[PDB]
PDB file of C-alpha atoms and ligand atoms in Angstrom:
ATOM      1  CA  UNK A   1     -22.700  44.258   0.438  1.00 29.76           C
ATOM      2  CA  UNK A   2     -22.928  40.947  -1.581  1.00 29.09           C
ATOM      3  CA  UNK A   3     -24.796  39.253   1.245  1.00 28.56           C
ATOM      4  CA  UNK A   4     -27.479  42.627   0.954  1.00 27.01           C
ATOM      5  CA  UNK A   5     -27.340  41.960  -2.775  1.00 26.90           C
ATOM      6  CA  UNK A   6     -28.328  38.512  -2.144  1.00 27.75           C
ATOM      7  CA  UNK A   7     -31.453  39.235  -0.214  1.00 27.77           C
ATOM      8  CA  UNK A   8     -34.719  38.741  -2.280  1.00 26.96           C
ATOM      9  CA  UNK A   9     -36.408  42.087  -2.675  1.00 28.01           C
ATOM     10  CA  UNK A  10     -39.419  43.978  -4.056  1.00 29.57           C
ATOM     11  CA  UNK A  11     -38.766  47.678  -5.451  1.00 30.89           C
ATOM     12  CA  UNK A  12     -42.224  49.659  -4.960  1.00 29.63           C
ATOM     13  CA  UNK A  13     -40.629  53.137  -5.203  1.00 32.23           C
ATOM     14  CA  UNK A  14     -39.010  53.423  -8.767  1.00 30.48           C
ATOM     15  CA  UNK A  15     -39.420  55.957 -11.687  1.00 29.05           C
ATOM     16  CA  UNK A  16     -38.430  54.252 -14.967  1.00 28.46           C
ATOM     17  CA  UNK A  17     -37.526  57.680 -16.316  1.00 26.02           C
ATOM     18  CA  UNK A  18     -35.294  58.013 -13.411  1.00 30.66           C
ATOM     19  CA  UNK A  19     -33.137  54.797 -14.086  1.00 33.65           C
ATOM     20  CA  UNK A  20     -32.011  56.659 -17.458  1.00 35.45           C
ATOM     21  CA  UNK A  21     -28.077  56.261 -17.071  1.00 33.44           C
ATOM     22  CA  UNK A  22     -25.906  58.791 -18.834  1.00 33.37           C
ATOM     23  CA  UNK A  23     -24.538  56.237 -21.135  1.00 37.19           C
ATOM     24  CA  UNK A  24     -28.083  55.109 -22.386  1.00 37.45           C
ATOM     25  CA  UNK A  25     -29.107  58.766 -22.766  1.00 36.77           C
ATOM     26  CA  UNK A  26     -26.325  59.599 -25.270  1.00 35.67           C
ATOM     27  CA  UNK A  27     -26.981  56.311 -27.035  1.00 36.32           C
ATOM     28  CA  UNK A  28     -30.593  56.942 -27.568  1.00 31.75           C
ATOM     29  CA  UNK A  29     -29.789  60.682 -28.494  1.00 31.36           C
ATOM     30  CA  UNK A  30     -27.334  59.110 -31.078  1.00 29.49           C
ATOM     31  CA  UNK A  31     -29.899  56.612 -32.453  1.00 30.85           C
ATOM     32  CA  UNK A  32     -32.602  59.543 -32.431  1.00 32.50           C
ATOM     33  CA  UNK A  33     -30.002  62.091 -34.121  1.00 31.50           C
ATOM     34  CA  UNK A  34     -30.464  64.377 -31.262  1.00 28.95           C
ATOM     35  CA  UNK A  35     -27.904  67.141 -30.502  1.00 28.54           C
ATOM     36  CA  UNK A  36     -27.401  67.095 -26.660  1.00 25.28           C
ATOM     37  CA  UNK A  37     -26.782  70.429 -24.659  1.00 27.22           C
ATOM     38  CA  UNK A  38     -24.146  67.945 -22.942  1.00 28.77           C
ATOM     39  CA  UNK A  39     -20.875  67.812 -24.505  1.00 27.03           C
ATOM     40  CA  UNK A  40     -20.186  64.120 -22.969  1.00 26.15           C
ATOM     41  CA  UNK A  41     -21.395  61.584 -20.557  1.00 21.87           C
ATOM     42  CA  UNK A  42     -19.073  62.920 -18.151  1.00 24.85           C
ATOM     43  CA  UNK A  43     -20.435  66.521 -18.440  1.00 22.56           C
ATOM     44  CA  UNK A  44     -24.179  65.280 -17.759  1.00 22.57           C
ATOM     45  CA  UNK A  45     -22.889  63.048 -14.873  1.00 19.74           C
ATOM     46  CA  UNK A  46     -21.270  66.244 -13.200  1.00 19.64           C
ATOM     47  CA  UNK A  47     -24.847  67.972 -13.542  1.00 20.12           C
ATOM     48  CA  UNK A  48     -25.905  65.428 -10.990  1.00 21.84           C
ATOM     49  CA  UNK A  49     -25.620  68.059  -7.980  1.00 23.78           C
ATOM     50  CA  UNK A  50     -28.961  68.731  -6.474  1.00 22.97           C
ATOM     51  CA  UNK A  51     -30.040  71.366  -3.591  1.00 20.48           C
ATOM     52  CA  UNK A  52     -33.647  70.266  -3.621  1.00 20.91           C
ATOM     53  CA  UNK A  53     -36.421  68.357  -5.246  1.00 17.68           C
ATOM     54  CA  UNK A  54     -36.994  70.794  -8.215  1.00 17.70           C
ATOM     55  CA  UNK A  55     -33.453  71.069  -9.115  1.00 20.61           C
ATOM     56  CA  UNK A  56     -33.388  67.362 -10.044  1.00 23.84           C
ATOM     57  CA  UNK A  57     -36.789  67.576 -11.555  1.00 24.12           C
ATOM     58  CA  UNK A  58     -35.852  69.924 -14.248  1.00 25.79           C
ATOM     59  CA  UNK A  59     -32.842  67.978 -15.079  1.00 24.05           C
ATOM     60  CA  UNK A  60     -34.650  64.482 -14.851  1.00 25.58           C
ATOM     61  CA  UNK A  61     -37.617  66.039 -17.350  1.00 24.53           C
ATOM     62  CA  UNK A  62     -34.961  67.351 -19.695  1.00 25.02           C
ATOM     63  CA  UNK A  63     -33.509  63.752 -20.017  1.00 26.91           C
ATOM     64  CA  UNK A  64     -36.707  62.622 -21.116  1.00 29.01           C
ATOM     65  CA  UNK A  65     -36.367  64.113 -24.384  1.00 30.37           C
ATOM     66  CA  UNK A  66     -34.298  61.114 -25.889  1.00 29.00           C
ATOM     67  CA  UNK A  67     -37.359  58.729 -25.212  1.00 27.21           C
ATOM     68  CA  UNK A  68     -38.823  58.855 -28.613  1.00 25.54           C
ATOM     69  CA  UNK A  69     -39.839  55.366 -29.924  1.00 21.66           C
ATOM     70  CA  UNK A  70     -41.312  52.181 -28.649  1.00 20.37           C
ATOM     71  CA  UNK A  71     -37.514  50.675 -28.821  1.00 23.89           C
ATOM     72  CA  UNK A  72     -36.621  53.456 -26.559  1.00 23.08           C
ATOM     73  CA  UNK A  73     -39.136  52.666 -23.934  1.00 22.09           C
ATOM     74  CA  UNK A  74     -38.276  48.918 -24.221  1.00 21.66           C
ATOM     75  CA  UNK A  75     -34.408  49.697 -23.888  1.00 24.55           C
ATOM     76  CA  UNK A  76     -35.076  51.943 -20.810  1.00 21.72           C
ATOM     77  CA  UNK A  77     -37.101  49.330 -19.003  1.00 21.87           C
ATOM     78  CA  UNK A  78     -35.244  46.389 -19.947  1.00 22.73           C
ATOM     79  CA  UNK A  79     -31.981  47.852 -18.637  1.00 23.34           C
ATOM     80  CA  UNK A  80     -33.580  48.388 -15.469  1.00 23.95           C
ATOM     81  CA  UNK A  81     -35.038  44.756 -15.195  1.00 26.87           C
ATOM     82  CA  UNK A  82     -31.470  43.532 -15.803  1.00 27.71           C
ATOM     83  CA  UNK A  83     -30.201  45.546 -12.924  1.00 32.71           C
ATOM     84  CA  UNK A  84     -33.065  43.842 -10.845  1.00 32.26           C
ATOM     85  CA  UNK A  85     -32.195  40.422 -11.972  1.00 29.33           C
ATOM     86  CA  UNK A  86     -28.479  41.255 -10.738  1.00 30.84           C
ATOM     87  CA  UNK A  87     -29.580  42.636  -7.495  1.00 30.11           C
ATOM     88  CA  UNK A  88     -32.258  39.952  -6.867  1.00 29.47           C
ATOM     89  CA  UNK A  89     -35.227  42.320  -7.135  1.00 28.55           C
ATOM     90  CA  UNK A  90     -37.865  39.469  -7.644  1.00 27.45           C
ATOM     91  CA  UNK A  91     -40.985  42.015  -7.858  1.00 26.38           C
ATOM     92  CA  UNK A  92     -41.089  45.556  -9.233  1.00 25.28           C
ATOM     93  CA  UNK A  93     -44.086  48.066  -8.900  1.00 22.63           C
ATOM     94  CA  UNK A  94     -42.414  50.819 -11.084  1.00 19.70           C
ATOM     95  CA  UNK A  95     -43.779  54.326 -11.890  1.00 21.38           C
ATOM     96  CA  UNK A  96     -43.851  56.032 -15.338  1.00 23.00           C
ATOM     97  CA  UNK A  97     -45.014  59.617 -15.895  1.00 26.40           C
ATOM     98  CA  UNK A  98     -47.160  59.377 -19.274  1.00 29.11           C
ATOM     99  CA  UNK A  99     -47.407  63.202 -19.463  1.00 32.05           C
ATOM    100  CA  UNK A 100     -43.761  63.606 -20.057  1.00 36.65           C
ATOM    101  CA  UNK A 101     -43.986  61.861 -23.003  1.00 34.21           C
ATOM    102  CA  UNK A 102     -47.449  62.549 -24.390  1.00 36.56           C
ATOM    103  CA  UNK A 103     -46.996  66.273 -23.874  1.00 36.76           C
ATOM    104  CA  UNK A 104     -44.139  65.950 -26.108  1.00 36.13           C
ATOM    105  CA  UNK A 105     -46.147  64.128 -28.888  1.00 38.78           C
ATOM    106  CA  UNK A 106     -45.324  60.734 -28.187  1.00 37.28           C
ATOM    107  CA  UNK A 107     -48.176  58.637 -28.342  1.00 34.93           C
ATOM    108  CA  UNK A 108     -49.681  56.952 -25.247  1.00 39.74           C
ATOM    109  CA  UNK A 109     -49.632  53.517 -27.002  1.00 40.13           C
ATOM    110  CA  UNK A 110     -45.806  53.879 -27.669  1.00 41.44           C
ATOM    111  CA  UNK A 111     -44.819  54.547 -24.155  1.00 39.39           C
ATOM    112  CA  UNK A 112     -46.841  51.616 -23.155  1.00 35.00           C
ATOM    113  CA  UNK A 113     -45.977  49.293 -25.720  1.00 36.91           C
ATOM    114  CA  UNK A 114     -42.277  49.537 -24.906  1.00 34.90           C
ATOM    115  CA  UNK A 115     -42.544  49.284 -21.350  1.00 36.21           C
ATOM    116  CA  UNK A 116     -45.139  46.501 -21.353  1.00 33.81           C
ATOM    117  CA  UNK A 117     -42.810  44.423 -23.933  1.00 33.64           C
ATOM    118  CA  UNK A 118     -40.018  44.869 -21.378  1.00 35.16           C
ATOM    119  CA  UNK A 119     -42.070  43.859 -18.420  1.00 34.87           C
ATOM    120  CA  UNK A 120     -43.239  40.673 -20.234  1.00 34.79           C
ATOM    121  CA  UNK A 121     -39.493  39.725 -20.833  1.00 35.54           C
ATOM    122  CA  UNK A 122     -38.799  40.640 -17.168  1.00 35.50           C
ATOM    123  CA  UNK A 123     -41.269  38.159 -16.145  1.00 34.64           C
ATOM    124  CA  UNK A 124     -40.742  35.098 -18.649  1.00 37.13           C
ATOM    125  CA  UNK A 125     -36.891  35.314 -18.839  1.00 34.88           C
ATOM    126  CA  UNK A 126     -35.956  37.065 -15.517  1.00 33.39           C
ATOM    127  CA  UNK A 127     -38.707  35.591 -13.290  1.00 30.03           C
ATOM    128  CA  UNK A 128     -39.763  38.926 -12.279  1.00 31.41           C
ATOM    129  CA  UNK A 129     -43.298  39.989 -11.442  1.00 32.78           C
ATOM    130  CA  UNK A 130     -44.479  43.432 -12.075  1.00 30.68           C
ATOM    131  CA  UNK A 131     -47.173  45.943 -11.279  1.00 27.62           C
ATOM    132  CA  UNK A 132     -47.047  49.169 -13.467  1.00 28.42           C
ATOM    133  CA  UNK A 133     -48.241  52.124 -11.827  1.00 28.12           C
ATOM    134  CA  UNK A 134     -49.393  55.250 -13.935  1.00 27.33           C
ATOM    135  CA  UNK A 135     -48.186  58.438 -12.132  1.00 21.66           C
ATOM    136  CA  UNK A 136     -49.659  61.747 -12.614  1.00 21.92           C
ATOM    137  CA  UNK A 137     -47.615  65.005 -12.767  1.00 20.99           C
ATOM    138  CA  UNK A 138     -48.715  67.157  -9.745  1.00 18.11           C
ATOM    139  CA  UNK A 139     -47.343  70.347 -10.908  1.00 18.52           C
ATOM    140  CA  UNK A 140     -49.814  70.085 -13.904  1.00 15.01           C
ATOM    141  CA  UNK A 141     -53.771  70.811 -13.685  1.00 15.51           C
ATOM    142  CA  UNK A 142     -56.161  68.091 -12.418  1.00 15.56           C
ATOM    143  CA  UNK A 143     -57.795  68.814 -15.653  1.00 14.18           C
ATOM    144  CA  UNK A 144     -54.364  67.530 -17.508  1.00 14.11           C
ATOM    145  CA  UNK A 145     -54.210  64.458 -15.068  1.00 13.34           C
ATOM    146  CA  UNK A 146     -58.072  63.654 -16.058  1.00 12.88           C
ATOM    147  CA  UNK A 147     -57.196  63.874 -19.897  1.00 14.54           C
ATOM    148  CA  UNK A 148     -54.419  61.227 -19.132  1.00 11.59           C
ATOM    149  CA  UNK A 149     -56.643  59.379 -17.155  1.00  9.68           C
ATOM    150  CA  UNK A 150     -59.068  58.893 -20.222  1.00  7.01           C
ATOM    151  CA  UNK A 151     -56.233  57.787 -22.222  1.00  9.25           C
ATOM    152  CA  UNK A 152     -55.472  55.172 -19.742  1.00 10.81           C
ATOM    153  CA  UNK A 153     -59.056  53.756 -19.290  1.00 15.91           C
ATOM    154  CA  UNK A 154     -58.681  51.327 -22.460  1.00 17.76           C
ATOM    155  CA  UNK A 155     -55.476  50.475 -21.033  1.00 20.87           C
ATOM    156  CA  UNK A 156     -56.461  50.080 -17.470  1.00 24.10           C
ATOM    157  CA  UNK A 157     -55.564  46.271 -16.758  1.00 24.84           C
ATOM    158  CA  UNK A 158     -51.982  47.556 -17.535  1.00 26.34           C
ATOM    159  CA  UNK A 159     -51.841  49.346 -14.442  1.00 24.49           C
ATOM    160  CA  UNK A 160     -52.201  48.305 -10.708  1.00 24.90           C
ATOM    161  CA  UNK A 161     -52.421  51.734  -9.525  1.00 26.55           C
ATOM    162  CA  UNK A 162     -52.102  55.613 -10.256  1.00 26.06           C
ATOM    163  CA  UNK A 163     -49.681  57.564  -8.308  1.00 27.17           C
ATOM    164  CA  UNK A 164     -48.691  61.207  -8.051  1.00 26.59           C
ATOM    165  CA  UNK A 165     -45.318  62.623  -8.205  1.00 29.70           C
ATOM    166  CA  UNK A 166     -43.466  65.834  -9.319  1.00 31.22           C
ATOM    167  CA  UNK A 167     -43.095  69.215  -7.366  1.00 33.52           C
ATOM    168  CA  UNK A 168     -44.891  68.465  -4.027  1.00 32.68           C
ATOM    169  CA  UNK A 169     -44.630  71.836  -2.049  1.00 33.43           C
ATOM    170  CA  UNK A 170     -47.769  73.999  -3.218  1.00 28.98           C
ATOM    171  CA  UNK A 171     -49.421  71.089  -5.166  1.00 28.19           C
ATOM    172  CA  UNK A 172     -51.165  69.045  -2.150  1.00 26.73           C
ATOM    173  CA  UNK A 173     -52.814  65.792  -2.931  1.00 27.83           C
ATOM    174  CA  UNK A 174     -56.260  67.539  -2.527  1.00 29.44           C
ATOM    175  CA  UNK A 175     -55.724  69.111  -6.020  1.00 30.99           C
ATOM    176  CA  UNK A 176     -56.112  65.589  -7.278  1.00 32.60           C
ATOM    177  CA  UNK A 177     -58.930  64.235  -5.262  1.00 32.87           C
ATOM    178  CA  UNK A 178     -61.502  64.226  -8.155  1.00 33.55           C
ATOM    179  CA  UNK A 179     -59.263  62.342 -10.690  1.00 34.01           C
ATOM    180  CA  UNK A 180     -58.233  59.765  -8.028  1.00 33.64           C
ATOM    181  CA  UNK A 181     -61.780  59.363  -6.872  1.00 28.97           C
ATOM    182  CA  UNK A 182     -62.636  58.595 -10.720  1.00 30.06           C
ATOM    183  CA  UNK A 183     -59.418  56.305 -10.898  1.00 33.99           C
ATOM    184  CA  UNK A 184     -60.605  54.229  -7.969  1.00 29.62           C
ATOM    185  CA  UNK A 185     -63.968  54.362  -9.389  1.00 28.88           C
ATOM    186  CA  UNK A 186     -62.688  52.935 -12.514  1.00 27.19           C
ATOM    187  CA  UNK A 187     -60.764  50.028 -10.676  1.00 30.27           C
ATOM    188  CA  UNK A 188     -57.400  51.607 -10.050  1.00 28.17           C
ATOM    189  CA  UNK A 189     -55.681  51.218  -6.577  1.00 25.29           C
ATOM    190  CA  UNK A 190     -53.873  54.361  -5.454  1.00 23.93           C
ATOM    191  CA  UNK A 191     -50.368  55.595  -4.169  1.00 21.80           C
ATOM    192  CA  UNK A 192     -48.822  58.795  -3.820  1.00 19.03           C
ATOM    193  CA  UNK A 193     -45.774  60.867  -2.751  1.00 17.70           C
ATOM    194  CA  UNK A 194     -46.325  62.541   0.398  1.00 17.06           C
ATOM    195  CA  UNK A 195     -43.971  64.138   2.895  1.00 17.34           C
ATOM    196  CA  UNK A 196     -40.664  63.964   0.859  1.00 17.33           C
ATOM    197  CA  UNK A 197     -40.466  67.902   0.811  1.00 21.26           C
ATOM    198  CA  UNK A 198     -44.494  68.365   1.906  1.00 22.34           C
ATOM    199  CA  UNK A 199     -45.489  68.637   5.388  1.00 20.00           C
ATOM    200  CA  UNK A 200     -47.033  65.846   7.250  1.00 22.65           C
ATOM    201  CA  UNK A 201     -50.555  67.371   6.448  1.00 21.03           C
ATOM    202  CA  UNK A 202     -50.031  66.342   2.867  1.00 26.11           C
ATOM    203  CA  UNK A 203     -49.460  62.728   4.083  1.00 28.62           C
ATOM    204  CA  UNK A 204     -52.857  62.945   6.054  1.00 31.48           C
ATOM    205  CA  UNK A 205     -54.269  64.174   2.754  1.00 29.16           C
ATOM    206  CA  UNK A 206     -52.856  61.210   0.470  1.00 29.27           C
ATOM    207  CA  UNK A 207     -54.273  58.799   3.432  1.00 28.16           C
ATOM    208  CA  UNK A 208     -57.622  60.218   3.754  1.00 28.21           C
ATOM    209  CA  UNK A 209     -58.325  62.106   0.334  1.00 26.54           C
ATOM    210  CA  UNK A 210     -56.564  60.151  -2.084  1.00 26.50           C
ATOM    211  CA  UNK A 211     -56.929  56.822   0.050  1.00 25.14           C
ATOM    212  CA  UNK A 212     -53.735  55.627  -0.894  1.00 29.50           C
ATOM    213  CA  UNK A 213     -52.532  51.923  -0.152  1.00 32.84           C
ATOM    214  CA  UNK A 214     -48.960  53.267   0.560  1.00 33.98           C
ATOM    215  CA  UNK A 215     -47.183  56.447   1.169  1.00 34.76           C
ATOM    216  CA  UNK A 216     -44.137  57.114  -1.020  1.00 36.49           C
ATOM    217  CA  UNK A 217     -41.267  58.514   0.769  1.00 39.45           C
ATOM    218  CA  UNK A 218     -43.289  59.798   3.769  1.00 36.80           C
ATOM    219  CA  UNK A 219     -40.192  60.631   5.944  1.00 39.37           C
ATOM    220  CA  UNK A 220     -41.715  63.888   7.032  1.00 36.04           C
ATOM    221  CA  UNK A 221     -44.274  61.925   8.870  1.00 36.89           C
ATOM    222  CA  UNK A 222     -41.618  61.788  11.540  1.00 36.35           C
ATOM    223  CA  UNK A 223     -42.485  65.208  12.844  1.00 35.24           C
ATOM    224  CA  UNK A 224     -45.903  64.134  13.370  1.00 37.92           C
ATOM    225  CA  UNK A 225     -46.530  61.657  16.362  1.00 38.52           C
ATOM    226  CA  UNK A 226     -50.434  61.334  15.983  1.00 37.49           C
ATOM    227  CA  UNK A 227     -49.394  60.364  12.428  1.00 35.91           C
ATOM    228  CA  UNK A 228     -46.574  58.085  13.504  1.00 37.53           C
ATOM    229  CA  UNK A 229     -49.156  56.401  15.783  1.00 38.94           C
ATOM    230  CA  UNK A 230     -51.475  55.852  12.976  1.00 41.29           C
ATOM    231  CA  UNK A 231     -48.600  54.471  10.672  1.00 40.80           C
ATOM    232  CA  UNK A 232     -47.704  52.030  13.157  1.00 40.08           C
ATOM    233  CA  UNK A 233     -51.321  51.037  13.848  1.00 40.51           C
ATOM    234  CA  UNK A 234     -52.628  50.591  10.448  1.00 40.67           C
ATOM    235  CA  UNK A 235     -49.244  49.206   9.368  1.00 38.94           C
ATOM    236  CA  UNK A 236     -49.375  51.373   5.877  1.00 39.26           C
ATOM    237  CA  UNK A 237     -46.252  50.915   3.989  1.00 34.57           C
ATOM    238  CA  UNK A 238     -43.683  53.680   3.240  1.00 32.60           C
ATOM    239  CA  UNK A 239     -41.705  53.404   0.225  1.00 32.10           C
ATOM    240  CA  UNK A 240     -38.487  55.190   1.907  1.00 31.31           C
ATOM    241  CA  UNK A 241     -35.484  56.446  -0.731  1.00 31.93           C
ATOM    242  CA  UNK A 242     -32.278  56.652   1.345  1.00 30.57           C
ATOM    243  CA  UNK A 243     -30.013  58.103  -1.255  1.00 33.43           C
ATOM    244  CA  UNK A 244     -32.787  60.295  -2.961  1.00 33.48           C
ATOM    245  CA  UNK A 245     -33.323  61.918   0.459  1.00 33.47           C
ATOM    246  CA  UNK A 246     -29.521  62.384   0.722  1.00 33.48           C
ATOM    247  CA  UNK A 247     -29.089  63.775  -2.654  1.00 35.07           C
ATOM    248  CA  UNK A 248     -32.218  65.924  -2.671  1.00 37.98           C
ATOM    249  CA  UNK A 249     -30.985  67.375   0.686  1.00 37.88           C
ATOM    250  CA  UNK A 250     -33.991  66.150   2.713  1.00 35.95           C
ATOM    251  CA  UNK A 251     -31.468  64.887   4.989  1.00 41.74           C
ATOM    252  CA  UNK A 252     -28.043  66.775   5.357  1.00 37.93           C
ATOM    253  CA  UNK A 253     -26.424  63.384   5.874  1.00 36.31           C
ATOM    254  CA  UNK A 254     -27.404  59.893   5.829  1.00 34.95           C
ATOM    255  CA  UNK A 255     -26.233  59.354   9.517  1.00 33.34           C
ATOM    256  CA  UNK A 256     -29.213  61.644   9.925  1.00 32.43           C
ATOM    257  CA  UNK A 257     -31.860  59.151   8.271  1.00 30.64           C
ATOM    258  CA  UNK A 258     -34.743  58.316  10.347  1.00 29.95           C
ATOM    259  CA  UNK A 259     -35.667  54.895   8.443  1.00 29.55           C
ATOM    260  CA  UNK A 260     -34.043  52.747  10.820  1.00 32.33           C
ATOM    261  CA  UNK A 261     -35.805  54.489  13.689  1.00 32.94           C
ATOM    262  CA  UNK A 262     -38.948  54.000  11.982  1.00 34.10           C
ATOM    263  CA  UNK A 263     -38.485  50.493  11.456  1.00 35.61           C
ATOM    264  CA  UNK A 264     -37.360  50.059  15.369  1.00 30.52           C
ATOM    265  CA  UNK A 265     -40.770  52.040  15.848  1.00 34.12           C
ATOM    266  CA  UNK A 266     -42.823  49.692  13.911  1.00 35.99           C
ATOM    267  CA  UNK A 267     -43.537  51.675  10.814  1.00 34.37           C
ATOM    268  CA  UNK A 268     -43.577  49.348   7.962  1.00 31.36           C
ATOM    269  CA  UNK A 269     -41.024  50.997   6.005  1.00 31.03           C
ATOM    270  CA  UNK A 270     -39.320  49.647   2.706  1.00 31.13           C
ATOM    271  CA  UNK A 271     -35.951  50.321   1.001  1.00 30.17           C
ATOM    272  CA  UNK A 272     -36.033  51.741  -2.732  1.00 30.68           C
ATOM    273  CA  UNK A 273     -33.932  53.389  -4.945  1.00 30.37           C
ATOM    274  CA  UNK A 274     -36.302  55.964  -6.454  1.00 34.99           C
ATOM    275  CA  UNK A 275     -34.199  57.473  -9.421  1.00 33.82           C
ATOM    276  CA  UNK A 276     -31.386  55.140  -9.488  1.00 33.07           C
ATOM    277  CA  UNK A 277     -29.494  56.824 -12.439  1.00 31.60           C
ATOM    278  CA  UNK A 278     -29.486  60.333 -10.350  1.00 33.44           C
ATOM    279  CA  UNK A 279     -28.912  59.431  -7.152  1.00 32.39           C
ATOM    280  CA  UNK A 280     -25.904  56.939  -7.867  1.00 31.86           C
ATOM    281  CA  UNK A 281     -27.360  53.661  -6.607  1.00 32.45           C
ATOM    282  CA  UNK A 282     -30.074  51.025  -7.162  1.00 35.01           C
ATOM    283  CA  UNK A 283     -31.704  49.326  -4.451  1.00 35.88           C
ATOM    284  CA  UNK A 284     -28.697  47.128  -3.061  1.00 39.43           C
ATOM    285  CA  UNK A 285     -26.835  50.489  -2.822  1.00 39.19           C
ATOM    286  CA  UNK A 286     -29.454  51.902  -0.729  1.00 40.74           C
ATOM    287  CA  UNK A 287     -29.477  48.945   1.787  1.00 38.35           C
ATOM    288  CA  UNK A 288     -25.742  49.155   1.775  1.00 36.55           C
ATOM    289  CA  UNK A 289     -25.692  52.944   2.496  1.00 37.64           C
ATOM    290  CA  UNK A 290     -27.790  52.038   5.515  1.00 35.34           C
ATOM    291  CA  UNK A 291     -25.370  49.709   6.907  1.00 37.04           C
ATOM    292  CA  UNK A 292     -22.441  52.005   6.117  1.00 36.47           C
ATOM    293  CA  UNK A 293     -23.945  55.215   7.689  1.00 34.30           C
ATOM    294  CA  UNK A 294     -26.307  53.878  10.060  1.00 30.60           C
ATOM    295  CA  UNK A 295     -24.817  50.628  11.145  1.00 27.49           C
ATOM    296  CA  UNK A 296     -27.893  48.606  10.278  1.00 26.62           C
ATOM    297  CA  UNK A 297     -27.774  44.973  11.103  1.00 26.40           C
ATOM    298  CA  UNK A 298     -28.420  42.065   8.925  1.00 24.78           C
ATOM    299  CA  UNK A 299     -31.272  41.698  11.161  1.00 22.91           C
ATOM    300  CA  UNK A 300     -32.840  44.845   9.960  1.00 23.03           C
ATOM    301  CA  UNK A 301     -31.972  44.039   6.647  1.00 24.32           C
ATOM    302  CA  UNK A 302     -34.018  41.071   6.518  1.00 21.84           C
ATOM    303  CA  UNK A 303     -37.006  42.613   8.058  1.00 19.88           C
ATOM    304  CA  UNK A 304     -36.788  45.679   5.489  1.00 21.98           C
ATOM    305  CA  UNK A 305     -36.610  43.070   2.614  1.00 24.23           C
ATOM    306  CA  UNK A 306     -39.528  41.218   4.009  1.00 27.18           C
ATOM    307  CA  UNK A 307     -41.711  44.468   4.377  1.00 27.70           C
ATOM    308  CA  UNK A 308     -41.122  45.049   0.629  1.00 30.61           C
ATOM    309  CA  UNK A 309     -42.666  41.540  -0.088  1.00 30.64           C
ATOM    310  CA  UNK A 310     -45.214  41.894   2.539  1.00 29.20           C
ATOM    311  CA  UNK A 311     -46.303  45.480   0.852  1.00 30.46           C
ATOM    312  CA  UNK A 312     -46.692  44.444  -2.735  1.00 29.59           C
ATOM    313  CA  UNK A 313     -50.233  45.041  -4.304  1.00 27.76           C
TER     314      UNK A 313
HETATM  315  N1  ADE B 401     -38.907  60.947  -5.876  1.00 28.43           N
HETATM  316  C1  ADE B 401     -39.655  62.169  -6.558  1.00 28.43           C
HETATM  317  N2  ADE B 401     -40.288  62.961  -6.145  1.00 28.43           N
HETATM  318  C2  ADE B 401     -41.151  63.733  -6.917  1.00 28.43           C
HETATM  319  N3  ADE B 401     -41.214  63.747  -8.356  1.00 28.43           N
HETATM  320  C3  ADE B 401     -40.194  62.774  -8.614  1.00 28.43           C
HETATM  321  N4  ADE B 401     -40.266  62.387  -9.988  1.00 28.43           N
HETATM  322  C4  ADE B 401     -39.526  61.502 -10.030  1.00 28.43           C
HETATM  323  N5  ADE B 401     -38.812  61.029  -8.785  1.00 28.43           N
HETATM  324  C5  ADE B 401     -39.597  61.917  -8.043  1.00 28.43           C
HETATM  325 ZN1   ZN B 402     -40.247  59.115  -6.272  1.00 29.21          ZN
END
């Protein structure tokens, strides 16, 4: 563990909103004078039991209510940056979901100010490089994403890419091909969630329609050998999230996770925490789970950490 924790790493698949610890949630609620549905932290924490992606999302979006001020968004991000320092994550390319906040009335500029301020501290005080990624909510319309991209244009230099998260199944990457096209035209790189719950086909779409630089999750690629051969051949990175897949029931157990299989086959996989406050672990805890449940070796530990460095944008 401490050896794992000592490894230099880059986290490339993380949602800032998904780092919202129960304690922070209650503290922001207090500061913002919000009456929570949850009686206590302990009760909110017991609600972290999931049977699929959707059950998690509903709760995950519910939590975002307490994010109201610039200081809120600073606290959220700074708390995570501190975890990174402690776990020797030296480089972060985090997601945020503008629509979750803008749709609640919070100004786009306020969200960004808070996050940007923290990232600046992360780098000058903690030594942590960052590449903010703006993620679209895929259950909403492409039109809504276009409106979000328009807000992002004056800010475009604050983002290294646009991503795509939220309810995967029944919202294929194709639904968002136009806005992605425009984003790239405007100088954005692209990434996308694909093959978490969605089929291999969605991953082909991300690759070929959205033209992503990396696949987020991408575990269901395992079902598709032609795709596997392509991943291995193009060295397209996968941002795999062990505890997230476990907690969302992608795998019925951690002993059944295929990330080490992929590693050995030559897929350029990485280790990430995804939504650490909800899945009960940060990046080091994800490496640890691999060692515990899949007898991962230091050997494979070093390779995974290195892929994450190599896969930076
Ligand atoms: N892993 C994930 N998949 C889909 N939507 C998400 N929103 C936050 N994390 C997510
Ligand atoms: Zn994710």
